[model samples]
Target chain A: NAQAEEFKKYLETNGIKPKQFHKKELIFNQWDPQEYCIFLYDGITKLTSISENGTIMNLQYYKGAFVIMSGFIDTETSVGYYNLEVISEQATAYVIKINELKELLSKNLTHFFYVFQTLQKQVSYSLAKFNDFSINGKLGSICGQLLILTYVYGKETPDGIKITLDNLTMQESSAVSRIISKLKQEKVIVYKNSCFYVQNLDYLKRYAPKLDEWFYLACPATWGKLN
Target chain B: NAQAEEFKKYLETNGIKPKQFHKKELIFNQWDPQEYCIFLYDGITKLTSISENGTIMNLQYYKGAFVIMSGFIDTETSVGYYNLEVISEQATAYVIKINELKELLSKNLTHFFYVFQTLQKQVSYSLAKFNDFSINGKLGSICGQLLILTYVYGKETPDGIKITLDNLTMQSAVSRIISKLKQENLDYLKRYAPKLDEWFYLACPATWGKLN
Candidate 1:
């Protein structure tokens, strides 16, 4: 929240206005003319895209104060790469125009570092997933993604670590149900009363041996300390 | 070459000495203790890694002057992520320690921009490839890689654009995908002088009738 507040203050001082949207409102759609990067002040947003098979895949979920709609910063295009939609009941965000931000970044290296570093984290995470796909197909890649979620939304519990994300949001492939079934059968993971649990970290870790490496690589040093 | 010359000068001025590597010599191996990130003054290097199935995969081929062994920078690690080997007969490179570069970047934002931007380009390209995999799978992803090669190594010829990269270097998947493409008589690609040659008549997907 502090980082969001800091960024919000920076944007307001620079004359950017906050916009509010209700649930299911699209911040940006795929191939839409991308002009601004949205910085969420409050609430959650989902980044989704439809694959060739027409199955919609969720790329990422952002909560509270976080950066989104930033793929264009490096791509240098006028069209968005993915569909960004608000998922919470209500959300407030600052739409920072890409051109204006570029002009501002020229005079402010500190702010430039903040913005690009945020983007770098997202891109690195994507690249890590891509590498997972190359090495481990869909099932293994899904396991890698689940491990990444543990870093973000996982909570320590008396029995095991509970993953708070809904399984529907974790759907990237049609084989997800079968894969999860296999994991449950093997006792590598447990699903009871709608939440996923990980009691033996090493059992799950074997499926994604290099995940910790990639996750730490993508996560910033300051983030490690805060977490 | 100009950029490489400029960077070489910058490294020299900072007292980092140039090191020479011969063909097939690894600058850094997979999981090796990574200390210095190499700056290629001249020659080529191939970034390679073994898959889970024990098959060796070539990730990227860097030619002329490039920056390799940089994955550790953003990762903040002491181990190399991939194997980097000299492919050219001989390569001249400057190995700058990671700690030293971090110190240099803190004092010089201009140089910092140069290094991170190089890394940014590499990471962006990888992200693009990653998206291709998620949408297109193996066949579409290979086609996407072929299209990207057109941007870097493609040469316009009398008939069509020729990609100079060897077909062997293009092997990310097995021969099944190649067989599938052959059966389809893919519209975007054309046969050049030999069967192994690459002649892209209309490379982009927008021009092609179908992807898979």
Candidate 2:
């Protein structure tokens, strides 16, 4: 027997109504009165807030996570003003009243505080690293390229994984393809089905091999088979 | 005018007693009855647990941070039977009664839950990556090296930060150092840290090759 049914019953008993959202949908739009706090049940969501002059500020990116807003718990605002977009093609989310989230958080502060501290550390670490690279050396683009590669190719699969050009933006896809093509020329990785198999991991190992290292050490428990 | 006076007053009003410990000192030993939770105001502390056969499980290494044993709250063993050792040469920690921690958590669930979630995610993420590398490749070893590098060289001063090593053991440290030396010989970081000075340069552009 599956625990999904039991889980559903547990939620019902706890009075939590979980909702879902599709891909490319708006979870919350700008200037919308913030009502319910949205929690990501599955998939990725991006928060894009527009400035007064219409410039968009990507405040945060969330995947399979929850969002806690100042307005949600506070009595000052009843509506959400940020524009939240679903980045994953088939994203699933859950919504709970702000007060309910607060209650849950209150009850499980010890457990939850650990998570917040880790995340804050991660964000701060990445930002600092990025700032250092950008300011000290002209390595932003390469770092960005490596991030793309690590995100896609760093995973382990029973059968090799395939990454399509469609998986990335036109520019990113092109850049990744070029890197792969160069690596291939240097006998580093083998490309097929728009996916690159790391044939010569030792080759890419020379250039920022620590990239993969950082990803694992910083957030080891969440990636690959560990999940 | 500084906020130090107000902060010190707040700590006094809250009844928080700050203390210090020397390296290798045990703040709490395994199987000791959990009575109070210790918060790190400064320096580092190690959490180690012993099994029935006397095997030590280095659970966590905490520094400049707060720790709560589960036995302290809910009238149960908040922290499992573990040894809390001082890792830093000279360490300072703020000890709070378990009751006080419970009260704070109960009142500030938001902040408490945030920290809890962070720890959970970190442990989960670390475990996941470890499992992935153990099964797939030597990525875990590579990761260990990077952590040590970041520990030794990564700038935390800019962010008003401190680097805390968790679950530190002699074997682990030795292994990490060996890996770093091996990678350095292989020129693995030519693009990132071409010269030793590159370490201090912060984040540099990936395309740059100025350092010779």
The residue pairs found clashing in candidate 1 are none
* Model 1, span A1-227: residue lDDT tens: 44457678888888998999987788877656655678887888877665545766564677766765433343344322457788877899888776676566556555655654555555445544555655666666768866766766667777777777666654424587778788888776788767777766565455665555666565544226323
- Among all windows of ten consecutive residues in candidate 1 chain B, which has the lowest summed lDDT? B192-201
Tell me how each candidate scores on DockQ against the true complex: 0.17, 0.05
Candidate 1, fnat value? 0.03
Expressed as tens digits, the lDDT of each residue in B34-138 for candidate 2 is 555665656667666543444454545665544434242533333234477887777776666666666765665444543343333333233233333333234
Q: How well does candidate 1 score on lDDT at residue A25? A: 85
Top DockQ hit: 1
Q: Note the Cα lDDT for every prediction shown.
A: 0.61, 0.47
Error of 1 at B37 (Å): 4.3
Error at B159, model 2, angstroms:
32
List TM-scores of chain B, every candidate.
0.69, 0.60
Distance from true location, Cα of B42 in model 1, Å: 4.9
